[PDB]
């Protein structure tokens, strides 16, 4: 949307990742699979949860109509009473409707942001040890087994440890053979 990730350079989502909002798909000799990023997914949940609660909470005090009756010669204050009570119903309704519209935009873009940011987390870890494919995926220049995959997902990826194997591949690759 604003951050260009959800329905942007990452086109469409993964029907097959059910245990979180954001995560990874990996693919190597040892198989393939989906995996949620727990911490980002949790931050999203904390955020949206606090957000929904804050909306509920701020609307807690708010105008409460009361019935008052008036006789046939108290029409002016009866009208003044109606227009007053309607006046506030209109205000709170505007505030409520407009808050929802504005916060939905914020929520959707929040997610868009979260995803870009998760993508950028991997990007700046791997650097030139992997090739940016343009679709949300990275292709390693070195072998990355299930242990290595987990290291990327949890912040523990050691660049120096693989940097040698990576540079060796690019060399073969650059000459064209």
């Amino acid at each position: 949307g604003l951050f260009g990730a959800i329905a942007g350079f990452i086109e469409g989502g993964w029907q097959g990742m059910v245990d979180g909002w954001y995560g990874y798909h990996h693919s190597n000799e040892q198989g393939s699979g989906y995996a949620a990023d727990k911490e980002s997914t949790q931050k999203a949940i904390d955020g949206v949860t606090n957000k929904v609660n804050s909306i509920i909470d701020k609307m807690n005090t708010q105008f409460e109509a009361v019935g008052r009756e008036f006789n046939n010669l108290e029409r002016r204050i009866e009208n003044l009473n109606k227009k007053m009570e309607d006046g506030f119903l209109d205000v709170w309704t505007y505030n409520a409707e407009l808050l929802v519209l504005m916060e939905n935009e914020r929520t959707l873009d929040f997610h868009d942001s979260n995803v870009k940011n998760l993508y950028d987390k991997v990007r700046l870890q791997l650097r030139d040890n992997a090739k940016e494919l343009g679709n949300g995926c990275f292709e390693f220049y070195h072998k990355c087994d299930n242990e290595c995959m987990e290291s990327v997902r949890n912040g523990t990826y050691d660049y120096p440890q693989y940097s040698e194997e990576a540079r060796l591949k690019r060399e073969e690759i650059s000459s064209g053979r």
């Binding site: 904390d46 955020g47 949206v48 606090n50 957000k51 804050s54 909306i55 916060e103 914020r106 929040f110």
Partner: protein, 111 residues
């Protein structure tokens, strides 16, 4: 051997000032601005120049009709606001009623 470096970064300090956000409460920030005054001085005062008419145990009725116990207020100088207790002891010493009393008080709000 290591090479030279430049880093991009941002200010931190020993502030424990805190702001709220729709998504997150009690966010600790480097700098902040309070915009609510919660303090007063507990006294009734002259307003711009002008001392208020502070009736004591007299009521507005008591004053205008000139209940004997309100003699202190027989002839008051220009005032800025009037101050009246919730239940002035010196009101209508002779029991009765003061017509459109509230509408009159409303008139005083402009005098």
């Amino acid at each position: 051997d290591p090479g030279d470096q430049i880093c991009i970064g941002y200010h931190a300090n020993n502030s424990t000032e805190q702001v709220d956000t729709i998504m997150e409460k009690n966010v600790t920030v480097t700098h902040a601005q309070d915009i609510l005054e919660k303090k007063h001085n507990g006294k009734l005062c002259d307003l711009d120049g002008v001392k208020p008419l502070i009736l004591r145990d007299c009521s507005v009725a008591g004053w205008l009709l000139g209940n004997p116990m309100c003699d202190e207020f027989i002839n008051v100088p220009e005032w800025s606001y009037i101050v009246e207790k919730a239940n002035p002891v010196n009101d209508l010493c002779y029991p009765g009623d003061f017509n459109d009393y509230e509408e009159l008080k409303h008139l005083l709000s402009r005098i």
